[PDB]
Amino acid sequence: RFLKVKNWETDVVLTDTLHLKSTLETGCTEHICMGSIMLPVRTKDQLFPLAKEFLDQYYSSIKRFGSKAHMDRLEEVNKEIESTSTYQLKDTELIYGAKHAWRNASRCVGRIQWSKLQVFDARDCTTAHGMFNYICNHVKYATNKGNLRSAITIFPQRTDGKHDFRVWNSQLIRYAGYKQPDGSTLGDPANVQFTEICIQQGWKAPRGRFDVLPLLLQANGNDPELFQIPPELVLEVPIRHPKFDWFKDLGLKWYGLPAVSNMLLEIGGLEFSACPFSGWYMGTEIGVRDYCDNSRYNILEEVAKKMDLDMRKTSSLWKDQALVEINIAVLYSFQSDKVTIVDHHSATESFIKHMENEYRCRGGCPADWVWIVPPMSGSITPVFHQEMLNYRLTPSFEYQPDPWNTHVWKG
Amino acid sequence: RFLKVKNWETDVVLTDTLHLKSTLETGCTEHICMGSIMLPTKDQLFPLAKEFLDQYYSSIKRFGSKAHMDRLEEVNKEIESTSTYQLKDTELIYGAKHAWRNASRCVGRIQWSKLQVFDARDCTTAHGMFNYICNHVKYATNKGNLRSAITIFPQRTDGKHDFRVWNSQLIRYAGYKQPDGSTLGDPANVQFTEICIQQGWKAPRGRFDVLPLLLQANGNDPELFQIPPELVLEVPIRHPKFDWFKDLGLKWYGLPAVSNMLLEIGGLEFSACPFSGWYMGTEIGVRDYCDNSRYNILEEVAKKMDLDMRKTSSLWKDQALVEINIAVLYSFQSDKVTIVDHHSATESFIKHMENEYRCRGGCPADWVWIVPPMSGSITPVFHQEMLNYRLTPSFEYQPDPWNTHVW
């Protein structure tokens, strides 16, 4: 069976067969669509099939399907599974794996870059200090003095579920949130709970509005440890506006390197619970969501006040006007300091190209419209008009519970 | 599989039990989400009728009553004997309000119970249809103080006798493709405009020509009729700050009146059922004016504002968009024509979702359609999980009549 998606701006119709390789489930049924729901030990049993399936794809990717090298590999993984109960990926398979997990990530608008990933193999890592060292090299390699390069660092895979590697931070760089006694929040409200744990673990909090959090690192199932990223490795950008000179006086900055650190990377049925990855920012991530979500820094009011907008009625669109200026300011500051960033028009246009290409060359491209459409000016971007099919392919990046919820304290 | 939805801005969690009544299919499976796809006999009729009457009598608290059973009895006899049946007026009104109640794509549903239903099931000709339509237009428009309405033409019988309004909305502007390849007027209506022209209409060929009504009774060939201009309330678009704005020469109409949908009630099909409410500002100011395939006025606006159009990262498109939308809202408000902004409408919808969860055990909602086409994440609906499913009575899409009509 073959499925059509139409783009309603251009009439371009595309044909999807790739969804026929979907194994995992969407969370939807014939009777209910869950397309907008945020989140809808493994033994020998399921393991060889999952391995075989990955290796067939891998050997196909390299035009060696059914080759002796292919057959021997299946044989050896099989024997390793029955004997040791798990198996090790070769370097080539890991790189390919990490690349496909990105390629298959339906909520990522940046996928046109998928094949250029820099994969850092941290599977020889044994301790949290070793983790801190790997992560430092990742931040420095990816930051690259403002000319950002995609990277991922892969820590040892899960074994029995009791020896997990985890990065307890949700991103490698993020600001502290602090709940004040009067009920207000200082810094980023999104990181209040994580901040508290850091504080409890012994972190001395400067208690400002932009304090870079310490790394909280767990190796081998052991209690996690704190480390401070060398500030010289943390590239930040002060926010100003090309016309509003009072904008700088708001005191805003952001970090240049977005580095998701809490997802799980599954390759050939193997689980990499610590696999921090990084690319670079689309401007709206910062200017719309980080700055203007009511539950984040929420600057709309103060920006609007300074613009002397009519704030007495929503239908003045004061909120929308401030939002544009803040996003102009974010992109301008980044470009000025020569730090990599992409605006939402450029990114979404690239995405449509990537997506058409992927349909032609691959048979499709799983895409989550809810997440792909940008959080401002949605319909003036070409993705708004693009029908998408969403489905789950492996290799993949999955959510996992926050470790402070499941971890067993050595104490 | 009683389901939770969470608002991520507020942490309000709501339990959905209403979805366990869903009947029709979504288009999705366990293996594929199709949430962003635009369009994903006697034996059949009685269960359909039963399911509807059961809800009706439940709604007025005479579930299981003699009057309930008697009605079921009666309708059943009438199907057996006549192969269809007729809705009581009360059932028709309930059915229409509920079809709007169930429309998972409509953000305006807080208003659902206030619908004015005009029963046109005694209509027999296109002239009669024109008369009904003008009365609807005039009633709904109400000199700018708009009022919700639907007008319901006779139901399908054998599919060879359908009533249809061929227009997609009662009131829309014409589209003409030019000698130089461009388009004057509304490009979305280029083809309908052709059918009107190749049906007799004399196009003024301007940028904002109100299209004629093309109306079809009892399966006959449809007929043209001009809406009395004095019943078409239009708004000249000016900006409260940019005096040059009015020289753009933009106007829009006050009455949004979708006319190409199919209303199903208790298994009966009403293939002509035009309904109207009033505009959320973005519909005109974002989609109608700025979509690339519609009036596409972004460059000309940004130019008059002297914006840096050299690079997309100046957000000139975005800047222009805010201003256009301020001008739409301002114009309608100045001329006292009902209009709602996207902030105010989405806040209402959240409140309505609240009400429905509490009073009905859920509210079907299609996030893809409910989040406005500008400033999505600064409206509360962006942060709101929604469960989408199909309840009946419903409004359904249907093919365009020209593909179907046997002349």
Ligand code: HEM
């Ligand atoms: C190179 C520049 C990149 C851009 C501009 C980009 C863009 C984005 C954006 C805008 C999102 C939505 C994030 C949000 O709203 O919170 C996202 C999600 C995602 N991206 Fe990327 N991305 C990039 C690189 C990467 C890389 C290197 C990976 C992995 C190797 C990745 C995997 C993902 C995943 C798994 C998600 C889903 C996140 C979630 O479910 O919370 N992306 N991407």
Ligand code: HEM
């Ligand atoms: C009272 C003011 C109303 C507002 C503000 C409103 C708002 C909207 C909006 C913004 C949409 C999406 C439209 C688009 O983007 O093309 C919509 C769709 C819809 N509304 Fe309403 N609505 C209102 C009244 C009504 C009424 C009176 C009915 C029917 C009785 C109705 C039924 C629908 C349906 C079926 C859709 C989806 C139509 C489609 O798929 O094209 N609404 N509504």
Ligand SMILES: C[C@H](O)[C@H](O)[C@H]1CNc2nc(N)[nH]c(=O)c2N1
């Ligand atoms: C409830 C809803 O699904 C949730 O707000 C999603 C919507 N789309 C998104 N899109 C992106 N890119 N990032 C997000 O956090 C979200 N949040």
Ligand SMILES: C[C@H](O)[C@H](O)[C@H]1CNc2nc(N)[nH]c(=O)c2N1
């Ligand atoms: C491809 C996609 O489904 C299509 O653009 C949709 C998206 N959301 C929408 N939302 C509304 N309110 N109206 C629309 O026409 C659309 N179009």
Ligand SMILES: N=C(CS)NCCC[C@H](N)C(=O)O
């Ligand atoms: N572009 C990327 C690499 S996937 N970022 C991902 C998440 C960053 C988050 N939205 C933030 O705004 O900090």
Ligand SMILES: N=C(CS)NCCC[C@H](N)C(=O)O
């Ligand atoms: N608000 C309504 C009544 S449901 N309109 C809906 C369809 C009109 C279309 N979006 C337009 O912008 O003309």
Ligand SMILES: [Zn+2]
């Ligand atoms: Zn779905």
